[model samples]
Target chain A: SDAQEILSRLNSVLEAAWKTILNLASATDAAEKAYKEGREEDLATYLDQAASYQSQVDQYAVETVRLLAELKKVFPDEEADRALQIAEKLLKTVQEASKTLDTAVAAAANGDEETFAKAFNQFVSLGNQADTLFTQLQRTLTNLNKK
Target chain B: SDAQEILSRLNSVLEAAWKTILNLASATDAAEKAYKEGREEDLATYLDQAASYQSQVDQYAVETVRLLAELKKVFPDEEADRALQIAEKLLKTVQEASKTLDTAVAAAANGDEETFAKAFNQFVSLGNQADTLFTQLQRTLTNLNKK
Candidate 1:
């Protein structure tokens, strides 16, 4: 039906989504800043916090994905589906990053500096998965209504 | 009195933030998808949704700014100051984008396609400023914990 009511609800979901993502990005930045200092204790603490935020991001992403399905019931658009896929991928990423962070925290806590370093090194690339898709989405959106 | 706590709080903020930007990016994608179809009604609706999302983004940015202030009170680093300035700039852009989207929706409603075009075009670039900074942050973080 393309009801304005449906669009309105989707907007609300998207509204909450942006806020949730913002919070997750903040945690990533803080974790990186701490990790740079190269102290096992600090790195462990920040990484743990990053993992927590990652969990939360995954949670909010789940809600957005659900709402997108609801939006599709009205709009029936491919972009809606594509958006859903992107959200799903991001959910997968943060969840993995969360686990990696936990592993790194544990390794660091155990004084296994090499293991922690390798684990955290793996953690560094976690955001790029989300970042790449975001860029693609950004490019498409920038031209969405253009002639 | 050092990096751990500062990094910890900061990580929480960064974590939340990346997710936030990702959310905004998705809205932009959705809005563009609608716009590409030249469906005035849908385009206007998406722009309005985009505008609402922009407002929500501004709120999160406000929270980030507050956290940055708290960070500065401790570290007083130039990087913190620089980050604050960047956050402030993004806030300004989203605020302008939000207003522009409102004006754009109205213009579309009035059958002023030209005005809407110009407004949406301006709105598209608004995100790039933040995107650039976010990318830089990601690169920084990626390099941060390197051994």
Candidate 2:
């Protein structure tokens, strides 16, 4: 029951983190649009929103780390280990995506169009990887749940 | 000359990061004041500004990571290694402070006054460590500049 409870909590935290990541992406999009339209104030507001979401993701990542330790304690099996690995990788990917977006914002501040675009693309790519990893983690968790 | 150039750039980046951290603290303080005053709109604005500074700190941390690698290549000595270690620890301390501040904000959002106060105090403590480390890092850089 403890393992199940941990699993349930982990699932909720992961879903919450995913939602925050989506919000971050949306904010980033709005910020980029504001930049293109020369709406400096709006750009600042949107970037700030994105940063808030980024902080939420970081908090969730920390929670996930704690949950993983508890999960390992309850279910010290190969399946749980696999899920842990995926979750850890997912956290790193999400953090990398966060940093990439920061680079894009910094580039935009300097009026470096090329670097901004490049960093934005990389952020998107990292986001895609994170999405994949999340799905994988969920699937792994599901298997662990059945066990 | 290249080593000197890299050292110069590192010093600038570190200084810029310290400035951003200071700005973040100021913005966070304003946000807290706004919250206590029940100025919701002002709170949002101040929190947004804090987030912006947080992003800048993240960007500078990335740059510092790169500069550290370049520095090691050019000056592979115990002194450089010591400076590298201090800078690395400073970066982590700064990041932890950022996360603690985020926790404080989240706790405030949830209306958990005790958690907010605890997290805020931790953020302040971590900020103090970061400040001390930054001073040490700059002193090391200054010594390297002499050599």
Candidate 3:
């Protein structure tokens, strides 16, 4: 009982930390946009960092889903599907980021400040949605043992 | 009785045809290389066609597998899996074709005929291998219910 209780408490904290990280990563999207608009000047290094942040969160979500599935004894096939959903969503986010970055980079290179601004704006717009998805996923996992 | 069994072979024939088409699509990877080597006038058009062919083949494979899975009660999962394996093998060819075409187009656009030709040669080689794979798949499908 004590162990279960401790695990529950730890998972809640862990989920909170994950949410915070997701939020932090998302917060960078605005700066990423401003950087793309040539207002930040050090865009290359910053873009690289943004890419890394998205990848890390993506990896974390997938791994955490898998670990929860195992811990909660989700059936193999069902767990695989859940993991697949997470991975696909994460990958989709990455691809979207790439496309946005591509447009921003091209626009900046071509000296089209307006296009760069649009791309940057899109980056800022997408983060809250991604965070919501992660939050929901975390909640689902946190309640795995109760039912 | 024997004639009826032999005559009612549309399913197997169609399956074989589909496999062959997929193989042909896979083999078209060489189209990019050939184009790169100065074999075509409209480089983008050629690459686009190959990409379109790949899209069609992928869609067909997905649909056919779905049909066999959902509609063809007699078609076992093992058969579906076998066909999928061949389809996946051909899919790798598709990936190769995509890469070859992309590189060839970029090289051609840069007016680097030498690099373009090099890319084309590699594409041709991959296309020939894909053709062989399709032939094998056709034979396998033909022998499906020959008892």
Candidate 4:
């Protein structure tokens, strides 16, 4: 039942990360909406809020990595590695997406309309990537259920 | 952030209960397949395994109720009450279904073929109910993401 207990703990840890993702998603969405509506003023705060979720997410990421490492000891094969890889990729995607958002904010602030436009599109594209990664991570983690 | 913490805890508790449901579902599915193939001899063990999931699920239910109650205190409004109500109904449905599964196993073991048949159909019916309840609970829980 150690595996089961790990799965239970893993779920709790994953849920923490999921909350931050949701928080980031919601904030990013609001920032996007503001950008679209010509309300560039509030983008700073919104993006900052999105940025704030980074530490929260990263904290869980550290815990998840530790748990996954423990799982690696348990599995000690591709399963644990793949699971960790999936989680890492998923977190990295979010991390990069958040960085992209920060750059977009900076672009908009400097009135670089053209780069800002590109950044906006990039933000949208990254949203899709984040969602895909999230699904992939969920699928990877749910593999524990088979055991 | 308090709301976020509650949401995180809520999700963790929900996932615990959900995992048990899935395990029970998978075992029940295997049992159903065996029953259809006249391999009813092993059905008792499968059903007993599924029944054992109830206590695990109930522990989470106790935590879920506590979390929802805390959420109620914080939210103190219709949305929280409605969300709590949905989860409560979902858990109750599963609880009822688990009990039904127990009796079905008993009927089968007693060699009461007529009663066993009815119990089998009822157990199958519970699958549909569980699905509906699961969807309702997901929709209700997703409301937290907006926070």
Candidate 5:
């Protein structure tokens, strides 16, 4: 269910979230620089947006770390490491693929067609990462069968 | 879909949402406490914004209050009252926000723009109250601080 919630949030970003960040990319350092100095409003919208993405990512990272910590405590070192590694790898794959989607979506803000289109190509079938995760879970379970 | 996600947080029996609503309410209370402790300026941004049960703006106002608490330990009387004010506001209005929202969605579902607009007008205003209710908190904090 929590995973589903993440997926749901992910779909939107996959759909259009990067546009929020790309608008500022033109003056990325400058916009962040301006925000630090308190020249908001002009950049408030975009910064708030980037903050959301950053926050969302930070949220996922925390949950992943927490979940790993819990799981690691329950299992032996090798298995625990393997399990968390798989989950993190699966998530990383999702994040990586999503970043491509982000690049393309971000392009909308920049009005770049090629990068956007190219990103779309790699954006397909991210669920495979989860599927791969499950398969690895099975594999890990089988290996643990020996012990 | 967003609507679905929003309501989805409210479990079939509304138990999950009830818990979150209370948590958000508690957060409002905590924020209120923090503000009175004498650090309102440190977290002014959080204190200035508000939202309600249906739209849960947790840290915006609450964190401002929290930071205030950090600065000082005296949770002034007004802050407590203000937090309770938010809880009462939610108690008084989420039912109405929900009923009207449901009606508006049903009308919208049937594709009646006239009915949608009519019901939506009432429902939308109620919906906005979540964000606007923060006005009460902000007004209270602003005045209280002047003390």
Candidate 6:
């Protein structure tokens, strides 16, 4: 039951993180739209919103680490360990995406259109990578349940 | 995030309940083997284990209701309501399977071979029904994620 409870919590945090990432993607799209439309104020606002969503995802990463610690304490099995590793990778991917977002925003503010475009593309790519990692995390947890 | 968290918990609990049902099936198989071999002690042991798993599933039902209540409070939507109705049906199916298991075990103890065989067949059929409901639950949660 402890295993079940902890795993349930872990799943919640992971899903929340995934949803936050999706929100970040939406903000990114809006920021790009504003930039293309020459709406500087809207561009700033959307970029700021994207950063905020990234911060939320960072908090989820913290919560996931705590949950993983609790999970390992109670359910120290191979599956739990595997989940921990997968979660770490997922969080790292998210962090990388966040960094790319920051670079894109800075380039836009500095009028470096070429760098902005490159970084924005990289940010989107990293977001897709994060999605893949989230899928992996889900598969790992499902396998844990099967045990 | 609240929706994500609640849905994640729902997924975990449902997966756990599904695993419990599978364990019950395994116990049933063992009991049937014992019955065919005329191993009365083994038959009783396996039957009792099957019942224990069934009771565990009953507890999951209680926990699921609590989670669903929490989910509805935090994430009321058409999908949440749909999950609630589907979960009710799933629990009902699990309960019916439990009853069939009981009937089969009782018949075995009473030396009513024909009734035991009949009830056992029904138990397996009901188990398959539970599996279908579990699959439906998974699909519901996955669709919720996509939103």
TM-score of chain B of each: 0.77, 0.85, 0.56, 0.85, 0.39, 0.85
lDDT order of candidates, top first: 6, 2, 4, 1, 3, 5
DockQ of each: 0.03, 0.04, 0.01, 0.02, 0.03, 0.01
Q: Write the per-residue lDDT of candidate 3 for residues B67-94, one digit (tens) a residue.
A: 3323233544675457545644654563
lDDT of 6 by residue, B2-103 (tens): 867877887788777765665565466667667788977667777777888888987787677677777788777677677667778878987898898899
Tens-digit per-residue lDDT, B1-147, candidate 4: 276688799888776666566555545665666677786655665566657765676567667767877987776656667777776776686677767776787888887778878877887787678668767766777776564
Which candidate has the top score in TM-score?
A: 2
Task: List interface RMSDs for the candidates, in order.
Answer: 10.9, 9.9, 19.8, 18.3, 15.9, 23.6
Over B1-147, each residue of candidate 1 has an lDDT whose tens digit, in order, gives 354565566566666666555445545565666567676655655566566657777786676677667767866766677767776776676677777777777887898878978887877776776667656544443333221
Stretches of model 5 off by over 4 angstroms after superposition:
A1-77, A127-147, B1-97, B102-147
Clashes of each: 31, 0, 4, 0, 5, 0
Q: Which parts of model 4 have CA positions greater than 4 angstroms off?
A: A1-147
What candidate 3 gets wrong by more than 4 Å, as runs, is A1-40, A62-87, B1-147
Candidate 2 Cα lDDT to native: 0.72
Instruction: Report the alpha-carbon TM-score of model 2 versus the true structure.
Output: 0.52
Clash pairs, model 3 backbone: B30-B123, B33-B120, B36-B116, B37-B117
Listed for each candidate, the true contacts retained, as a fraction, are: 0.00, 0.00, 0.00, 0.00, 0.00, 0.00
What is the docking quality class of candidate 6?
Answer: incorrect
How high is the CA lDDT of each candidate model?
A: 0.62, 0.72, 0.50, 0.70, 0.45, 0.76
Q: Against the true structure, what is every candidate's RMSD?
A: 13.8, 13.4, 24.5, 15.2, 17.6, 19.1
Per-model TM-score on C-alpha atoms: 0.45, 0.52, 0.36, 0.47, 0.31, 0.47
Q: Per-residue lDDT of A1-147 in model 3, one digit per residue for the tens?
A: 543554464366456547646654654665566664766435544544554454345334433433443343434346334533553464345435534543454344334679867986676566556656656555555554463
